[PDB]
Amino acid sequence: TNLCPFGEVFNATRFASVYAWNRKRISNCVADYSVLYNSASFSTFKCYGVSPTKLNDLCFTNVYADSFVIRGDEVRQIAPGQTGKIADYNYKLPDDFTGCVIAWNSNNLDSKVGGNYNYLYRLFRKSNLKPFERDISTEIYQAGSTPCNGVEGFNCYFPLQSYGFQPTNGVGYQPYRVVVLSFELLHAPATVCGPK
Amino acid sequence: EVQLVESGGGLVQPGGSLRLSCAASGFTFSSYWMSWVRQAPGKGLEWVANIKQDGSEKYYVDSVKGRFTISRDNAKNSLYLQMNSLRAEDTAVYYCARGQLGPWVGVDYWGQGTLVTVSS
Amino acid sequence: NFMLTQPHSVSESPGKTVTISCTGSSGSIASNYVQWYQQRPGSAPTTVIYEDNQRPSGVPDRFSGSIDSSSNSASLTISGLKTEDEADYYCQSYDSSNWVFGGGTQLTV
Ligand SMILES: *[C@@H]1O[C@H](CO)[C@@H](O[C@@H]2O[C@H](CO)[C@@H](O)[C@H](O)[C@H]2NC(C)=O)[C@H](O)[C@H]1NC(C)=O
């Protein structure tokens, strides 16, 4: 049975930023959840809407996967419902999710002694986003008055700030790769399904 | 139905070597996680160790690690636990436990348990 | 240091409903699944409620639970409160390559 490429989703050498999270779909294979819950490297395996007990029995047509890097104090912010700098900005999750959330700690792989500066995030936006949007534009923020029109002076700040990753801080400041799995079914024949 | 009987040693053994075996039957052994939980007399529950379904992974806590080893054998549908250098706080009853889905959801079937007493 | 705080002997009601709350200290308990185990001293325990809110087969529908993220605590509710419900329940939560356990609540009637 053709097996879905769950390896390259999790065992990826490079991970994108939270504000530029990737989206990869998978179809027409056989899903293997038995390699997911039989491991212990992850720190959060919570599934909203679909219980993990019947994960190997309940099976749908399309599966969506995301991947981005955050730290330890906003892992609860990824969950649907609560607010924060990773919730009202960058990523955003709907309230009717039928998927799962993956989280593990990778400190040595995602950081070195000199301090990582390759990760960015949206500090501030005009407003919140839809349950599923991507924000790539780096336009300057609009204060109550916006006379900068191209400069970075007063009342006009850069929305992107570098992300501090140093190996000797606390648990909540360490990098935390997060993978979000999305499950939904349409009016189409099932493509990926559990082994029999 | 499930049968989880064990043959642990309740004999007094101050700082020696004793092995516990928790037999399993009624289900496929090499498909689910295994774990060990311990309760002191008159106190609450506590966790000791857990082991992957293939024996590749094993975890303990700070106090129990370094003196407790655990390895399962899926061919004979049984598991073994061996400890050395016992101390005073090890007077408790040891229960062998099985996992419903892995390390996340937790225990689903509970064993009978043998009482282990260490003194001088 | 994910210690779980649970009161002792907080259920002293012969009738009405029962409420038991167990909270966490180091981090949010809503990130991982938290369950309760019904234990009969002098006998083997059994699972009364698993996952967040999932009742196992054979467990009566009187037992129910809830998750509140405001106080970072998990609740357990018993409806019938018969004589069989005498037990001590321990809240168990998942940690990174570790397992924690609650103090327990001795239910007297
Ligand atoms: C990501 O890579 C790791 C390491 O290569 C994989 O872990 C191994 O997976 C094989 C496949 O069954 C096992 O035989 C090994 O015992 C595993 N080793 C360890 C240390 O866990 C992991 O499976 C890969 N991830 C995916 C989704 O394939």
3-state secondary structure A11-49: CCCCCCCCCCCEEEEECCCECCCCCCCCCCCEEEEEECC
Element (H, E) at C21: strand C18-24
Ligand 1 close to Cβ of residue B119 (< 6 A): no
The beta strand positions in chain B, using DSSP E, are 17-23, 34-39, 45-51, 58-59, 68-73, 78-84, 92-99, 107-110, 114-116
Whether B6 maps to a domain, the answer reads: no
| Extended strands (E) in chain A | 22-26, 42-47, 62-71, 100-105, 175-184
Instruction: Please check whether residue A30 lies inside any domain of the structure.
Output: yes
- Pairing status of strand B78-84 against strand C46-49: unpaired
Who among A40, A53, A76 is closest to C30 (CB)? A76
Take atom 18 of ligand 1 and give the residue whose Cα is closest. B56
Mutate to test the interface with B, among C51, C99, C105 (most CBs of B within 10 A): C99
Q: Token digits for B27?
A: 């289900």
Residue with token string 């419902």 = A81
Residue B50 bridge partners (DSSP): B35, B59
C85 phi, psi to nearest 5 deg: -80, 10
Across A127-144, b (16+ Cβ under 10 Å) vs e yields eebeeeeebeeeebbeee
CA of B104 from ligand 1 middle (Å) equals 19
Minimal CA–CA distance to A105: which of A15, A171, A22, A21? A171
Contacts across the A-B interface (CB distance below 8 Å) = 21
Contacts of B63 (CB under 8 A, 6+ apart): none
User: Residue A27: inside a domain, yes or no?
Assistant: yes
Residues B49 and B34 sit within 8 Å (Cβ to Cβ) = no
Which DSSP category does A160 fall into? B
Q: Do you know the residue count of chain C?
A: 109
Chains sharing 3 or more CB pairs under 8 A with chain A: B, C
Domain extent at residue A14: 1-130+159-196
Q: How far is the CA of A131 from the centre of ligand 1 (A)?
A: 33
- Cα angle A110, A93, A156 (rounded to 5 degrees) comes to 70
Q: Kindly give the distance from the C-alpha atom of residue A100 to the centroid of ligand 1, in angstroms, as a whole number.
A: 20
Structural domain tally of chain A?
1
Let me know if residue B30 belongs to a domain. Answer: yes
CATH code assigned at B95? 2.60.40.10
Residue B73 inside a domain? The answer is: yes
Residue type, B112: Q
CA atoms of A87 and A121, how far apart (whole Å): 12
Whether residues B50 and C99 touch (CB distance < 8 A) is answered with yes
Domain assignment present for residue B3? The answer is no
Per-residue tokens: A80: 């649907």
Write phi, then psi, for A113 (nearest 5 degrees).
-70, -35
What is the dotted CATH code of the domain comprising C4-106?
A: 2.60.40.10
A24, two tokens? 């990869």
The domain in which residue B51 lies consists of 17-115
CA dist list (Å): C9 to A91, B9, B92: 44, 34, 23
Q: What residue type is C99 in one-letter code? A: W
Which residues, 6+ apart, have CB-to-CB distance to A196 below 8 Å? none
Q: Token pair of A137, please? A: 């534009």
Contact by Cβ (8 Å): B38, B95: yes
Which atom of ligand 1 is the closest one to the Cα of A39? Answer: 21
Pocket perturbation via mutation, ligand 1, pick of A8, A35, A179 by most ligand atoms within 8 A of CB: A35
CB B82 within 8 A of CB B12: no
Asked whether the beta carbons of residue C69 and residue A44 sit closer than 8 angstroms, the reply is no
Find residue A103's DSSP bridge partners.
Answer: A44, A178
Q: What is the pairing mode between strands B114-116 and B17-23?
A: unpaired
Query: Do A155 and A145 touch, CB atoms closer than 8 A?
Result: yes
Rg (CA), chain A: 19
Q: How far is CA A39 from CA A3, A43, A108, C101, C107, in A?
A: 18, 10, 20, 21, 36
The reported resolution of this PDB entry, expressed in Å, is 3.5
Q: What is the DSSP annotation of C40-55?
A: -TTS--EEEEBTTTBP
How far does the CA of residue A43 sit from the closest CA of chain C (Å)?
A: 5
Ligand 1 proximity of A11 Cβ (cutoff 6 Å): yes
Is B4 domain-assigned? no
> In chain C, after which residues does the backbone break, taking C–N over 2.5 angstroms as a break?
none
Pairing of β B92-99 and β B107-110: antiparallel
Q: Where are the domains of chain C?
A: 4-106
User: Using what technique was this structure determined?
Assistant: cryo-EM
CATH for A95: 3.30.70.1840
Chain C residues in contact with chain B using a Cβ-Cβ cutoff of 8 Å: 32-33, 35, 37, 39, 44-47, 50-51, 56, 88, 90, 92, 94, 97-104
Residue A150 lies in a domain: no
- Does B9 reside within a domain? no
Using the atom order of ligand 1, give the atom closest to the CA of residue A41.
21
